[PDB]
């Protein structure tokens, strides 16, 4: 059964810290505790070990990722930019 209407994971904090801060931290709490599909082995096991450190329990690979998400939008953009500059550099 649905146990809360809107707090969800930030129901652990009760009434404290304010609705907007709890609303903000809810987005991060879901993402930083999610299990992502590993791109090396395909199993949904990519889990955060520390801030910025993501580890897959199946293939044992470790990845330098984002603080709360597996990869950041900034890092994804930079990889494409570095890929494009590499082609032009050697044509």
């Amino acid at each position: 059964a649905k146990r809360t209407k809107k707090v969800g994971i930030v129901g652990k904090y009760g009434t404290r810290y304010g609705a907007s801060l709890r609303k903000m931290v809810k987005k991060i709490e879901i993402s930083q505790h999610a299990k992502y599909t590993c791109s090396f082995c395909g199993k949904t096991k990519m889990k955060r070990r520390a801030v910025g450190i993501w580890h897959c329990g199946s293939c044992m690979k470790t990845v330098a990722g984002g603080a709360w998400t597996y990869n950041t939008t900034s890092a994804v953009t930079v990889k494409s930019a570095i890929r494009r500059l590499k082609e032009l550099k050697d044509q």
């Binding site: 931290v25 910025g52 450190i53 990845v63 990722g65 950041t72 930079v78």
Partner: protein, 248 residues
Amino acid sequence: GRVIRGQRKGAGSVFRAHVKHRKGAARLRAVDFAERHGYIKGIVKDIIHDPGRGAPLAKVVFRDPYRFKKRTELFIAAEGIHTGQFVYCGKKAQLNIGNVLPVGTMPEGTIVCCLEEKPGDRGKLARASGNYATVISHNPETKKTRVKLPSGSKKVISSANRAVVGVVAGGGRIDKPILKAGRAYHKYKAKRNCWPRVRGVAMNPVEHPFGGGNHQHIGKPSTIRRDAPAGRKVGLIAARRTGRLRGT
């Protein structure tokens, strides 16, 4: 009056960095013949949390070109590198995330991290989590490069300075509210004795310029000149302006 807290921070004592569980200084490779003239290969063995640092660190292993040994380096982990990956350092390394190249060979607009302030210093700029520098331009005649730093300042550096391609991992860390004094207690228990911070107006005049009064007020302007003596230089130090930053 007595010596103020800011004065006492300089003597070391209870204000020294908490470095008991840190893993070592994060650095590039020391520049040698392989990086000067070609490239050297390495393998990312592990990516580890460093107490007190937001960014993760990568443990990279190289071969020693002169002795039968394995060299373990401790790099700032660029975002997207994984264990078992091969990284390459040197003049002729390819433009890939995690490789170490001189900024002179990088095309304009390259995104780099752990960039040398001076050629050979082994990486000093843009090392915080999520941060990076950019390459603006080169002057092959003067053998120098123009980069943009995470603060936004533009700097002219030698073209021979090395850097790691990509941005530092662990980005977006400051986007999470701490929500708790206790969580800030733990953040700084790994760094140094700087928390919590008592306000100047909350003290007596003996230990602070702003202390004292029947009302908690500064009483004197809080923008303090650049040349004020230690123990007086408190508040907004040499402020060019104050108030809300409205506009660009």
